[PDB]
Amino acid sequence: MKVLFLTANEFEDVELIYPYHRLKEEGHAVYIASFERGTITGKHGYSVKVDLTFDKVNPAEFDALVLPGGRAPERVRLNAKAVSIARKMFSEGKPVASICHGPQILISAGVLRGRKGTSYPGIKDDMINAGVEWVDAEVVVDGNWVSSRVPADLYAWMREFVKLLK
Amino acid sequence: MKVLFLTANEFEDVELIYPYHRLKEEGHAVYIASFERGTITGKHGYSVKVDLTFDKVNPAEFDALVLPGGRAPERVRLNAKAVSIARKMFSEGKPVASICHGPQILISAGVLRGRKGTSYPGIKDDMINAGVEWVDAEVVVDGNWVSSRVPADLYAWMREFVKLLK
Amino acid sequence: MKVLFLTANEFEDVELIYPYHRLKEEGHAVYIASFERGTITGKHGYSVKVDLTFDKVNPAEFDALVLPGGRAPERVRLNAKAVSIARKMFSEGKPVASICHGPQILISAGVLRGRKGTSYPGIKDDMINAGVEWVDAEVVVDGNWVSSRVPADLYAWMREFVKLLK
Amino acid sequence: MKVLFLTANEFEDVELIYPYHRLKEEGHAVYIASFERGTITGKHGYSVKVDLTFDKVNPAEFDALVLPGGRAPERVRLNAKAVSIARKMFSEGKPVASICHGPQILISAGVLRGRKGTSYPGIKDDMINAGVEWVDAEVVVDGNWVSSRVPADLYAWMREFVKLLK
Amino acid sequence: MKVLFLTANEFEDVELIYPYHRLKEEGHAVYIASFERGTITGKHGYSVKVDLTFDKVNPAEFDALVLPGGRAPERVRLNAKAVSIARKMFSEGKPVASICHGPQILISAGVLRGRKGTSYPGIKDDMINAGVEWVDAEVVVDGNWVSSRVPADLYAWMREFVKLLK
Amino acid sequence: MKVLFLTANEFEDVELIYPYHRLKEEGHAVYIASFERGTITGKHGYSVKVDLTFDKVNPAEFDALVLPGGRAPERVRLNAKAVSIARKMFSEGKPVASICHGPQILISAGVLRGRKGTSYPGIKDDMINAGVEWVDAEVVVDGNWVSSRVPADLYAWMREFVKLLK
């Protein structure tokens, strides 16, 4: 499968790097999309190369979506093209994985009312106001939506997600 | 007047320090409340002393409330006592000043339905979902609630808040 | 009024940002002058844009002068044009505000003989040797010269300087 | 299985965190051993809790061994007990994964003569002088010994190691 | 000889470490005095152990004095016991080496009027107001006083100083 | 004499700066060689200018060689030209000083079999496997080869090296 990541500077480093490698283990192709080509740098100083910009993404060409956390989702969610990608892929029923602040992008896409999931506890009230049935669990599977809360949850986050790509 | 600040580590430094001194200039008493007595440190490394904890605050004893930004509001808003302080003071009509991520504490208080205000743009969708009529202005006055967006609005933010304390 | 700031990289961040906004509140125009156009960054990482260089400043065009601290005054004071600006404005009776290491620029201007003021305590011996009657107070007003010591004096520093601009 | 990590301060953060979670996903128990109980911190600032000290480790009680990289291996390899843990588990045929600087501990254990593997290229000449047949590949499997070079190899590293624990 | 250093946190690292080792090469005993026992840390993060506090120094027991730069001299020069040590040793004619901001301590001792020397150029006007004949040179020898300006001067600074201890 | 340094980014700052100045004191010329012209930066933030790149170095034109430590030796030792510079000067009997990780370049040059010396203890087993008789001492002199372990050894390191250039 082709797996797309939406992110930017100040991503939470391990929430990007862990799924990136865990999905390559399975043989999937992984793509990093951001505002500009070049490199982006995490909160803790790991740098990754950007594969394409939001403007060049055709959502039809990707099979699954990963939304890491950090401070990056508060900037990505103000980009109409990035929010449009997540709206389309989530509403088409493609697998979507989010963790920590990552679902702020789905809040802004307007796709979450009635869905069941989790997030960083610091934004649970915002999830609830977007209509989420919010659950305090290390991983929640709701149809195509796999969500987790914090870096401690990584093992469970990707355990469930990889099942949906098989 | 006795002006109370609700904050914690990783406050945005100038959004705490600027209103602290601007209000001291007017002769008001300023108190920093947080989780624990001691010092708290800002995103940029400035330190300040905590006057009292959230448990020891009696909202009746204070006349106004200031909610600086940074990352601290996402922690504060998870503390039931801190949120109750903000609920009582805001709903009793006492003047409340908020900037950048500050109003996340008011979202969790449940007091923003049908009110008008602003915030850091990265959380404008969460403000709208809480019931806020969201405005892109350097300062917004809506009764007792004075709201601003970013550090560049500091001059206008306190210009309007100072008037409500006369 | 047109208020001029003389500064450079490694300014003490709140000693620039606090008077910048406090004076904007009053409706004054504030200009940052430095060695080169662009941005300058403070000790704690805040950045601000340079409005004009020292070479393009005509002291006749400005009404007041602010000299923040940090490590920048030790560089500024070596620039003959920056020192000449401070000499002319201070000796023409225009209001001048200085804090922490700020008055090092006035020492090099040669205009402090027999004047009364304060500074960061770590340079009080250099103030005395320049001819200053040195006072340990949160703010000192001596004609046109308003002087303070450390960031904890900000509220009193601008309280007194604002009066001279009315 | 019970999986043991030998490490210390200044480990390469993702070379510890990634196998940690990848092996919890399979249901294995994971134990971090270092010099002292408490927490250790990686080169990039992530912190993990130490489960037991080197002195308390009985190699017989553990089924597999992971040696992450960073600078920590140059300090671990000076601790005679830690080197004997590695020596015992490796020579008993138990699965051992090493990456980047990790195999420096195995050099010091004296168990690599005639074996085949890789490492951070910066220490390849030291691997060769310890008797290793050194290969430039993203992962090498030599019996019980799974070796990789750098953080970009993580996906392949644990892909092969996980097979040996089934 | 017994060589005494007066310093504190935020010394310029190489201006302390270079003379420390250069003087041990010759067989002299070197002692670090500061406010408190324990360790002090330079601007660039090197740490050194403090041998004794200002309170325990008997100036008669030391043969020569070294004053490194950094931000530390602005704190040391406010300590009456530290300034007293430098006053006594310099006025008794013992060898004294200073660099960069180091002579701020001698300014405060009141021993420099009529002497010839150099400093960091940023404080040359303060040297002049203390009565120094100020010279722009990599090293100046004036009787017992060897002075230099910046880290680039280290080689010449200690070349001349070691001659005075022979 | 003309003295050559082989190094790169992330050198141990004082292991380069101290021999640099100590050898200028004697009147020797000193040249920094690295991968690219411009500046390189040490682990602690000090910057030095690169005089020439490895490709332009003719070993015949230089009389002595210094190998500082840090992480830079693990990158320099992968550059075939830099290793051949070290190999040529060392085997021609020219004076060579190494400290901490520095001798990793000499391991890769193949010139240490049967020689006597020291290093950072963290790589002593690698020195032993390269054929060195490894000694725990602050300085070792083996013909043209002066070796030390750590920054605390600087005084002794250059004390012995300076003798070989007279």
Author numbering:
A (entry chain B), B (entry chain C), C (entry chain C), D (entry chain A), E (entry chain B), F (entry chain A): 1 to 166
Q: What does the publication say?
A:
Tb-Xo4 was added to the protein solution before filling the channels. It triggered the nucleation and the growth of large PhP1 crystals, which completely filled the available volume. An added value for macromolecules crystallized in the presence of Xo4 is the strong luminescence when illuminated by UV light. Final crystal structures were obtained either from a single large crystal and two wedges (Nb02) or from combining partial data sets from several individual crystals (RNA, CCA, Lip and PhP1). In the latter case, the use of ccCluster considerably facilitated the choice of partial data sets to be merged.
Here, a microfluidic device is described that enables the production of crystals by counter-diffusion and their direct on-chip analysis by serial crystallography at room temperature. Furthermore, the crystal structures of four proteins and an RNA were determined based on serial data collected on four synchrotron beamlines, demonstrating the general applicability of this multipurpose chip concept.
